[PDB]
Design a protein around this ligand. Sequence first.
Ligand SMILES: CN1CC[C@H](Oc2cccc(F)c2)C1=O
Ligand SMILES: CN1CC[C@H](Oc2cccc(F)c2)C1=O
Lengths: 412, 412
Amino acid sequence: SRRRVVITGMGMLSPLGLDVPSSWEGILAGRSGIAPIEHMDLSAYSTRFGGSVKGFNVEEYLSAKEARKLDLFIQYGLAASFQAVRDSGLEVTDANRERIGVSMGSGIGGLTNIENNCRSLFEQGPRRISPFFVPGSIINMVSGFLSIHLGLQGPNYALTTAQTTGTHSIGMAARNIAYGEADVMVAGGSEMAACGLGLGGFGAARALSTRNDEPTRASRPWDRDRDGFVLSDGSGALVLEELEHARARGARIYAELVGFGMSGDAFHMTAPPEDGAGAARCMKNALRDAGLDPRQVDYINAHGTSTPAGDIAEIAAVKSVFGEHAHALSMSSTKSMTGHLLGAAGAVEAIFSVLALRDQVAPPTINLDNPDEGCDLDLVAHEAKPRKIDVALSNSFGFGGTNGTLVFRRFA
Amino acid sequence: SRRRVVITGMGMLSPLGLDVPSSWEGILAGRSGIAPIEHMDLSAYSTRFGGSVKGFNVEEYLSAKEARKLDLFIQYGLAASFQAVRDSGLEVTDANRERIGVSMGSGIGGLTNIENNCRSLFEQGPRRISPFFVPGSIINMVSGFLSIHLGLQGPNYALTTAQTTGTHSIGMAARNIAYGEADVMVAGGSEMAACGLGLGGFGAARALSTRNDEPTRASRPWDRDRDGFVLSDGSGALVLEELEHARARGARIYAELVGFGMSGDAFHMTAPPEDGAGAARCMKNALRDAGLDPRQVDYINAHGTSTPAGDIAEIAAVKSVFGEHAHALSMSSTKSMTGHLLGAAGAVEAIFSVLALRDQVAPPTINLDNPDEGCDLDLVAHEAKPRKIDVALSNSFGFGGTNGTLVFRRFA
Ligand SMILES: CN1CC[C@H](Oc2cccc(F)c2)C1=O
Ligand SMILES: CN1CC[C@H](Oc2cccc(F)c2)C1=O
């Protein structure tokens, strides 16, 4: 029968910091993590900025010898996973190793590594492709490497659902624990798509903000002058744990995961429906899964990507689900500060939702100078808002019309 | 408690055929799908052969214009998915579309597309990258495109667990139905990694057979002269359906999916443990899930990749799990004929496991001329073996030590 699931550990790399507390300080201070990209020459690209992880030292986590073999998305995923496991206090033993699994996902995975090995192949020949190309690039290897390093013998898998990946990974890992397939899961996502193919590929679709001359103001969810998403790098990991398991070991519990929804739009490969029908269906599924009155929802961490169609679809979805209560909750997009971590977005935003519950504060939507037509909810413009938050909801939507909602609440 | 899950539709592209009955005819005849790779210069490569899909016509499924937007692995996954839904006779309606979902995965995803866009990027610069590069290359676009085309609003996701993808995709879709999150799922996997990057990436790790002189004899699981796996392309999809739902509409039921196991080895990034400890835990997990004694298993579709370490690990795991029953079951590798479809391997082998139940016949392991030391199980050498089969297992083991087992049972 269905068991309860709590959050006992969190870890993060973001454009605002190399761990959770540092990232969260930047979130509450309204700081932007967005800057011109330094790691490559983007003069031929229409977008030349994004949210880089600054000053990451992989030798805080792994030997230089093994790090050299791994794409940055794997390095970031392992860093966030190690932080979350350490933060949990959990001890892996022969007695519990078969009951601890991992589900760390990615939207695109090791695009930097694949681009670099493609360069080798085309300029030199296949004899210059790294022997570590496959295990160092494919998406499941965050889960794989984490399991090898910590001895986790529970369910070992990875989701790839584009910009919904982090939310789906956390939700499905919670279901694993709920249904008794595991007692503990490390779950979240990681992304590092800032290579030529990433910036060039989103750029060819004209999906990215082109505000090169003012990167910190580029990400402006629900602002009338928004012109697309800002591409960002990093990782989020959570340690999810069965309630009675967490209670038995005296774990510090941050919050309870009470609800998870998934819905397909079945609308369009890349565009969200204007009325937010898929996001509404997904949130309704998550609220019914959590056994909630929608009026219990105090805070929504929006997907809020700073796209014309995405941002207004989300307002439509929230008004349709919450009716008059839409005017009482607070909804914000931390992508205003972090940009869009793609497969990692739902993972870092799940952590931000849990911290909104811990600290009783709604993170701001920075850059919301001129709210667009119909964008008339409390979107927490400019400044963090202290308020009562018993229930927080984190939304993600992605290519393929794939939707996820997580519902968290305070645990006493 | 838990609902029962049955298989009501199947679809396939493989090196043996453009559908299930053609592929299965090849399997029972001991035919090889392996041949030198055409329309591609492999001069500088140590492997020049594999399992190609021959004569695939995407315009049976999609307009030329929609097919141009999508990597071959997505085309393949859609073809298998459309076949499986057709084969099921399911009528999608406003009354059931929120109860029908998709989980089609891939191990490596859009390497061919990435390769072609890399070529453009390096030669001409980022303005030649396709606008459809991202949505046409990401692994969740089989689930995304299928849901949009058929109007499916149930759970929409994609697994990526390397060579375990197809097995995990089917098992987790079965859990969705068992626990009431969907009534129908389309599940399986697709792969097309016969590009410079795939053949070069696996070749760089010396993982591939280099028997260029005799491609049809290269894949020789448990044979003392095996020298690595054969890379193959294609797709498998199954329609999974809640039993009462299948019975109410008068569905043709092929078999019941009674068990699913997952385990991590936590051993090595690419190598299995020699004693097959992870595969043994995974099979025991799947049998416990099914409420079956190891003695009830009649047929195992092995991972059986033709690698020195992997093939011997699987013998060890089977001897360990099945004890005095280990010789009574038949265990065969259909990869002897199909080669290794990586993320689709588990999907097409689940289909072969189901057809073994329908037709009461164990597929052969072809090329098993000289069983290796300790390879003394009933490996169905050379020729198909008619036999009693009530319970069939399908095993997948992949990079990151990720394991999957599906247990299928005759249904009447
Ligand atoms: C309404 N719009 C705006 C952008 C999006 O189109 C795309 C298309 C391809 C890749 C991508 F990243 C985005 C859409 O459907
Ligand atoms: C048991 N053996 C044989 C090859 C494999 O090693 C690799 C390593 C990297 C990529 C790959 F494709 C394979 C292994 O560890």
